[PDB]
Ligand binder design. Structure first.
Ligand SMILES: NC(=O)c1ccc[n+]([C@@H]2O[C@H](COP(=O)([O-])OP(=O)(O)OC[C@H]3O[C@@H](n4cnc5c(N)ncnc54)[C@H](OP(=O)(O)O)[C@@H]3O)[C@@H](O)[C@H]2O)c1
Ligand SMILES: NC(=O)c1ccc[n+]([C@@H]2O[C@H](COP(=O)([O-])OP(=O)(O)OC[C@H]3O[C@@H](n4cnc5c(N)ncnc54)[C@H](OP(=O)(O)O)[C@@H]3O)[C@@H](O)[C@H]2O)c1
Ligand SMILES: NC(=O)c1ccc[n+]([C@@H]2O[C@H](COP(=O)([O-])OP(=O)(O)OC[C@H]3O[C@@H](n4cnc5c(N)ncnc54)[C@H](OP(=O)(O)O)[C@@H]3O)[C@@H](O)[C@H]2O)c1
Ligand SMILES: NC(=O)c1ccc[n+]([C@@H]2O[C@H](COP(=O)([O-])OP(=O)(O)OC[C@H]3O[C@@H](n4cnc5c(N)ncnc54)[C@H](OP(=O)(O)O)[C@@H]3O)[C@@H](O)[C@H]2O)c1
Lengths: 264, 264, 264, 264
């Protein structure tokens, strides 16, 4: 079946890439970066995030795999030393698929726009253009809070180990179909009030951020960060779409969390 | 159908109880506190927790309802002024059922014991007998961390608004079948290391606490707190059992959270 | 003695300003905004911060007073209804002086620059140009940590109720001659490590931030926020300079904290 | 001059103790554990805390030194390998003295008692007898907050690296004459309100905890933890008394913090 390999582009990753391609030549197995059915990422988690966003229109037709050339990421998942074993396993068709939830982000504007929709594997965040940051937070059409602070982060389950974590969020097992909202430096006094706690939302729950003042926002979706102007609504929900992984071997989520934060 | 009413036992709750009983006399509707199919709690959330634990062997045959005589709890849910409307609605059989996940706790001992199993609607916690507190945390048979601190809290989704919240935990929608673990005053230096973050676990995941030193622990299950001696394992998992509520009207979880923490 | 009055510039503040000026005409008391000995701020804390920064070269020759036209700020301190009583008290010379510590910030560059020095009443912060943020933190010439995250905040004691607070910092009584450093969304895993906790530093302690990558930083000093380029060092220390307040009456710091965050 | 040595009482500490005593025999230098002028602690920080509490009536006449037989504590401060060098230095009278602030705790009761006063080098804490914990917090005679939660911790500056830290407190340089108050699992909703933040208090500020319900409290002072009954007031203040250290060499506080929490 058709595959492609992205590389971080340093000496180590390119050489491993060329080796795997040569390895794949002894099977069938066809290189195709337009319509791959396997996408192998070699580098780190940032490399892996770029690979996902490259093929974010073909998610239902692709199974991703990551190899880490340094740490040990949460998306890659294979050591360089295991590259040969992986070539043989991929070529044999010797894998089950595992799916992780994604986050759908919708930015609505005033005319012209032309709403934009984004898909995130880690998180989307919102901050001001700089700028006091003030939004009304609306959960399933009901006004929940007026947030004043530095911004908000909405994380997928596999994104919980990233930005979500730095902000005091929970780590959620990625079999849970949910998104998690954390505060960045909320202001709380006797007049301005936020929940404080991170909030975890199931599928079909919609979290809507609405401008109070100030309709310009710096919005991030994984690595991408853009200033959006004349924003009417930022709308968060668990995507109907999933990312599929090829595995292969047991490497439990909590073991990855252990290895990354406790040690090994 | 058979019902019973528990009261907080102050003047206000007893009178509302007697009124509802009189109200129920005009229907059928039979009072029975041994095998009720409806359990109405009048008081607060503590009243409601006592009602659940009274009937924790009959959960699959009961639908609970709470009335709050002060605040506004997360389990009750009806204002005293709505008592008459509720009598008519209960009597008519005019309700759908909503189910919340429960937490199963297993305490294993050395001979004699005779493991004990407990069911929690809010949380179970563990602290020392007093006492440095040190446990090994084992997730699905794999050693995750050695926790040193004041204790650990394992919360259900509806318990997230309680003890879980005070500890920095996430608020989780109770449609999510999960349990959440938070730290109490963890010790972290270059030698002792915990994850820090709260952890959210799906069904079938098992979290096991094992003594390092020190086999005596003060274990809480909702209101109940007991010193357990010669403990070999404390085992946490999402229960297969659920609590059923009678509703009635829309009162969304996030609206309850809003009313309780933001205002109204 | 010579005074001046700054106003927030809304209807309420301008009218109170003109009234106080008329009131001051019945005494002596001379209006002078070039070399005032009394600076009265009417508005909020932002108004007060602007007044301080206007006269930050004459601090040793000035006594500040704030009037709040809405809340209740930490710098103002007088209700509009008390304006007449304040005119008489100021004119009589009926006040003792109270001094608060200030924060000195030094930004060093590569040639050309021409180091810049700034004085802060609340805090100075550092974030990236956008941009992973990574700095080496050096305390009294010794390398303390490599910080990776969103930024750092260094707060004076009276600034602790502001940005410092949102970040998890301690509230410090302003009689303590100290500065406090908090983290913004620090990254911590088995490889990247920060202290986590806020750090409180006495006089003469120097905290130095040094670029790792990336020599461009968005630096704030109270309201002012500038992108500095080709930065070699950001240097934090308790200033030798103090701000002087005129009081008047007892309004204890902890009472102000109570009124602002608990209620009243 | 007269000295004494306490040991942790394991094989390693006793042998080092006997060696130092033999070493001290070649000077003058007299062993006296009733009225020592030098107290050397060999073990860890717990060993050191016991040594301080042994001689807490003679603080003004003593200079303490700690040797750590494992880690690296904040009070000891010398490696076993440096024991000989330390004997010679102590015997020569080749040291300046450094003083750290202490915390005075006063427990007032109803008749009989007979107030008790305690001195803490790390912290004093308060929790319930078990037991919802509810106290009124009164700062300099003014009611600041009604705290509901698990307890409160009041830490000295050198205690900030201990229990204070686990609770989210600031690390304070021990040249600052201050005490710091942190919350343990505070309850906060629209009805019950605490400050959240840690509070840092200068000398002469008095923090008073008063029972709301419930006059029984589990009070800790460093290692000591006692249930006090029929309590009317717990009163916290920076002590007029200081602990004196013998040094010797530069080992800056922030370097100790680095070594203990970052690495080395
Ligand atoms: N304060 C914060 O915690 C903070 C601030 C901004 C952004 N971020 C995170 O960085 C990600 C991408 O940022 P960027 O492209 O601008 O580069 P970046 O900030 O330099 O990347 C940050 C680090 O996040 C790691 N990472 C990626 N996914 C992760 C996951 N699911 N769990 C744990 N760590 C993960 C990456 O690992 P590799 O080295 O293997 O690539 C990288 O080292 C975002 O999606 C966000 O989660 C965090
Ligand atoms: N530091 C803390 O946050 C802390 C410490 C110990 C226990 N607790 C909580 O208290 C519960 C029972 O404790 P207790 O029997 O010993 O009496 P308690 O400590 O005096 O009760 C604590 C409060 O928790 C409220 N509560 C109960 N369930 C809740 C929920 N799901 N969400 C938000 N608040 C809730 C109760 O409301 P009502 O007034 O309506 O009854 C009560 O006022 C435990 O299950 C635990 O969650 C909290
Ligand atoms: N996430 C955060 O907590 C956050 C983010 C950015 C900036 N800030 C704070 O805002 C200050 C100025 O910001 P800005 O000029 O850009 O306008 P701003 O962000 O809109 O002002 C923020 C608020 O801080 C209040 N404030 C000022 N000094 C304070 C103090 N010492 N204690 C408690 N609150 C205080 C002001 O009160 P008034 O309404 O009376 O003016 C204002 O409402 C900064 O010095 C910083 O402390 C906080
Ligand atoms: N959750 C918590 O963070 C927690 C809970 C209870 C008590 N404590 C702390 O433990 C101290 C004594 O407790 P204990 O007698 O019952 O024995 P313990 O709890 O077993 O001792 C706790 C640890 O604290 C260390 N320590 C002592 N002073 C310190 C300091 N100033 N900075 C950093 N670490 C320090 C000790 O080091 P050594 O091994 O060298 O002796 C010991 O390992 C208390 O004074 C309190 O600060 C902390």
């Amino acid at each position: 079946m058709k595959y492609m390999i992205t590389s971080k582009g340093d000496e180590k990753s390119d050489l491993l890439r060329l080796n795997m391609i040569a390895g794949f030549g002894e099977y069938d197995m066809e290189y195709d970066d337009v319509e791959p059915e396997i996408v192998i990422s070699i580098g780190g988690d940032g490399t892996f995030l770029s690979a996902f966003h490259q093929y974010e229109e073909r998610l239902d037709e692709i199974a991703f795999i990551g190899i880490h050339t340094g740490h040990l990421g949460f998306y890659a998942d294979w050591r360089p030393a295991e590259a040969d074993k992986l070539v043989k396993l991929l070529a044999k068709g010797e894998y089950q698929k595992v799916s992780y939830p994604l986050l759908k982000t919708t930015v609505k504007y005033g005319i012209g726009k032309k709403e934009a929709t984004y898909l995130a594997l880690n998180e989307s965040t919102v901050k001001s253009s700089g700028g006091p940051f003030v939004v009304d937070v609306v959960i399933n059409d009901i006004h929940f809070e007026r947030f004043r602070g530095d911004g908000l982060c909405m994380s997928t389950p596999s994104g919980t180990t990233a930005y979500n974590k730095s902000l005091g969020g929970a780590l959620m097992h990625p079999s849970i179909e949910a998104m998690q909202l954390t505060e960045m430096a909320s202001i709380n006094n006797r007049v301005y009030r936020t929940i404080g706690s991170p909030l975890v939302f199931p599928k079909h729950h919609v979290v809507s951020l609405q401008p109070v003042n100030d309709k310009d926002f710096q919005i991030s979706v994984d690595h991408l960060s853009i200033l959006h102007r004349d924003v009417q609504e930022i709308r968060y929900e668990v995507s109907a779409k999933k990312i599929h992984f090829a595995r292969f071997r047991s490497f439990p989520f909590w073991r990855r969390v252990h290895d990354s934060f406790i040690e090994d």
